[PDB]
From a paper:
Encapsulins are a class of BMCs characterised by their conserved subunit (Enc), which self-assembles to encapsulate enzymatically active cargoes and can remain porous to cargo substrates. The overall structure of Enc subunits across species with different T numbers is conserved and consists of a peripheral domain (P-domain), an axial domain (A-domain), and an extension loop (E-loop). T = 1 encapsulins of Mycobacterium tuberculosis, the causative agent of tuberculosis, and the closely related Mycobacterium marinum, are known to encapsulate the DyP as a core cargo with iron storage ferritin protein (BfrB)28 and FolB as possible secondary cargoes.
In addition, we studied partial encapsulin structures to characterise stable encapsulin shell intermediates in vitro, by using low pH conditions to disassemble encapsulin shells, followed by reassembly at neutral pH. To explore the structural landscape of encapsulin shell formation, we used 2D and 3D (focused) classification and local symmetry to determine the structure of different stable encapsulin intermediates in an incomplete assembly state. This resulted in structures of three distinct intermediates of the encapsulin shell; a 48-mer (3,427 particles, 5.4 Å), a 52-mer (4,378 particles, 4.5 Å) and a 54-mer (6,294 particles, 4.6 Å). All three intermediates have an even number of monomers, appear to be closed on one side of the shell, and miss subunits on the other end. All three stable intermediates have an overall icosahedral structure with RMSD values for the 48,52 and 54-mer compared to the structure of the full shell of 1.08 Å, 0.60 Å and 2.66 Å respectively, although the 54-mer is, compared to the full encapsulin, flattened in one direction and elongated perpendicularly to it. The 48-mer and 52-mer retain their icosahedral geometry, whereas the 54-mer has a flattened appearance. The 48-mer has 39 fully resolved Enctb subunits (defined as cross-correlation value > 0.75) and 9 are less well resolved (defined as a cross-correlation value 0.5 to 0.75). The 48-mer and the 52-mer differ primarily by the addition of two more Enctb dimers along the edge, around a point of threefold symmetry. The addition of these dimers appears to increase the stability of Enctb subunits that previously were located directly on the edge of the hole. However, all dimers (in total 77) have both Enctb subunits present, and where a subunit around five or three fold symmetry is missing, its dimeric partner is also missing.
Numbering used by the authors:
A (entry chain LA), B (entry chain UA), C (entry chain OA): 1 to 265
């Protein structure tokens, strides 16, 4: 067995298939970051750091010796525990199709939110700079009126053009901004369609982020490094409940500072 | 070896591939001129002039002798030096993917700007007349209001129609004008889309030019002659930096005076 | 080419072969550490850190999220520059066999001394704990009289026996201690032979270390990780001299605290 200790969990095979399906579905729906960044293959469990290729000056060991430390970025392992009713698990073999997988959905939504907020806003404790912090283009303010959203977005499209950047540009919106441009309409279309006319990429719902992000998806600018992708593991169990977790280990690198514009309220 | 002296540069193979990729990418993005003019095959290093096929009267050598000089256009070699950190070059073999290629990008942007400004505004010292100067159609004034841009552009489309010209017409805009028609919107579309409806060619971002240019891309009207295309060459190096250059040799010919309209502010 | 920039050096092929032979020979003679520790295959230039498999508690990103940083050990790149006369280099093609390779020998001796002192005494700036510091067995004092050396060494052999350890034990001596037990004799043998009778391993000359070390060579206790093994690289040159360097990148790990005894004066 492995670190998931999956065979020790009192979960049947059919219940496991339903839990895997629910977690994978809810996660994909709430991920916006993997649609725009380069996603590496999983390195594996032993992978601990990503080389940046830079060098750090250290106090010379002896006379005439020049020493340099190799710089690297550590992976962070992110774990979201959740708790399942054993009655709901037992219902699945009897043929129930409405078993309560709400904790699985909440854990997948929380893991997806962490991953997206780590990619776009950073996680300083894990030495990850967000796309918002690593952007060299000027930051823009989103207006109160949703009918004035496409104007400011177009100004962001000016800045990537002034930065000398090609590629399909894509706009990612926070859930508040996505709702505002979805529910306001002008001439038989919502403002989301007006945003769709400005770019050759995609208007992407990004419920974890704040503000908005416009960026190129030409490739090679944004890199998500995975040691291991999302997995479900077993912690402990009692007569009534099974404690499990969702787990993934990653770091994020931004190679190109001028490939994005961040917007705030 | 050749005049690039490329093997003498202290640049690794992987670093060379990254520099070539960065320079080629940034150059294409900033070229507008090659999308509309006929571009010849590279003549080669020995190519020095392009025959125009005209004749120049010279003082008769002797009695009964009629002499004429063949007219030609000289090529100009354009060189943009740039300077790279050797630490950034050394980072590439160690696996860095964020090496500072800003000087390469600035050199490619500057070379592209020179080439486009030479094609459209001319370079008198190199005996190159620009498209703006060689146009026989009347010049138009671009209005201050971007909502009045498509009107004047349509008047330019009248002039090529009054000049008796067929073919897909294409509109090239300066970066100021492109930004103005991109960021102003009317009825759910930016003014750039309104320009796109007027022509069967393309709205082309041309950040080097001034004003705007409307012209036919039927072929055979505008000819860019290349002796050698863009190449990267090695000048000199020290402990910290490598001096290199971008280099291209060309001339530009406009055969058809009535195939274009220039616009100014 | 690579980071060594070897083809840029004004060094002939025969001179290169002599320099490689001299450096490799002098290095092996002065290495004691690789004879007793496990030496990994070279990871390669991109390798920057070694995973330890441990976890570091970090401030929770959000509520209900448990985060942990993966622990790792950075590699250190160690570079010893040296300077060669170009006349000595030119002598080699003419058939000289006494070309002055003293700087190569001094650079190889200095690199070997650094590597051995890093393995056995540590390099705190590179986060490397030495075998002396990581040993859990008690430290012993070497006596002034060399005839009393084998007694104390035998007490060290008691401690590894009290630590519950098997395997061929090996004794490494500093150059002072090796000279003292080599030059003092008892009953027709030097004291080095008396040390040789106590162990089934080897009396190893270790000129870089202080004191003495007794340890098991059963395997899996001491691990030297190499990104890249010893290589010769080219820095710069003038009319008279060529500046080159010896370079290696490594870290050292001690997995088993009770597998060694350190001795001091």
């Amino acid at each position: 067995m492995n670190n998931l200790y999956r065979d020790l969990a009192p979960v049947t095979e059919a219940a496991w298939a339903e839990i895997e399906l629910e977690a994978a579905r809810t996660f994909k729906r709430h991920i916006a970051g993997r649609r725009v960044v380069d996603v590496s293959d999983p390195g594996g469990p032993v992978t601990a750091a990503v080389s940046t290729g830079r060098l750090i000056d250290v106090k010379a060991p002896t006379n005439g010796v020049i020493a340099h430390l190799r710089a690297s970025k550590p992976l962070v392992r992110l774990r979201v525990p959740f708790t399942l009713s054993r009655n709901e698990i037992d219902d699945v073999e009897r043929g129930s199709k409405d078993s309560d997988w709400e904790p699985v959905k909440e854990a997948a939504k929380k893991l997806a939110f962490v991953e997206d907020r780590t990619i776009f806003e950073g996680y300083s404790a894990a030495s990850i700079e967000g796309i918002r912090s690593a952007s060299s283009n000027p930051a823009l303010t989103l207006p109160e009126d949703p009918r004035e959203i496409p104007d400011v977005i177009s100004q962001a499209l000016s800045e990537l053009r002034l930065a000398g950047v090609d590629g399909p540009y894509s706009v990612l919106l926070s859930a508040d901004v996505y709702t505002k441009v979805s529910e306001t309409s002008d001439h038989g279309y919502p403002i989301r369609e007006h945003l769709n006319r400005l770019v050759d990429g995609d208007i992407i719902w990004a419920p974890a982020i704040d503000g908005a992000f416009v960026l190129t998806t030409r490739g090679g600018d944004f890199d998500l490094q995975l040691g291991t992708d999302v997995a479900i593991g077993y912690a402990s169990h009692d007569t009534d409940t099974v404690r499990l977790y969702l787990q993934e280990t990653l770091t994020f690198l931004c190679y190109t500072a001028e490939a994005s514009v961040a917007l705030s309220h």
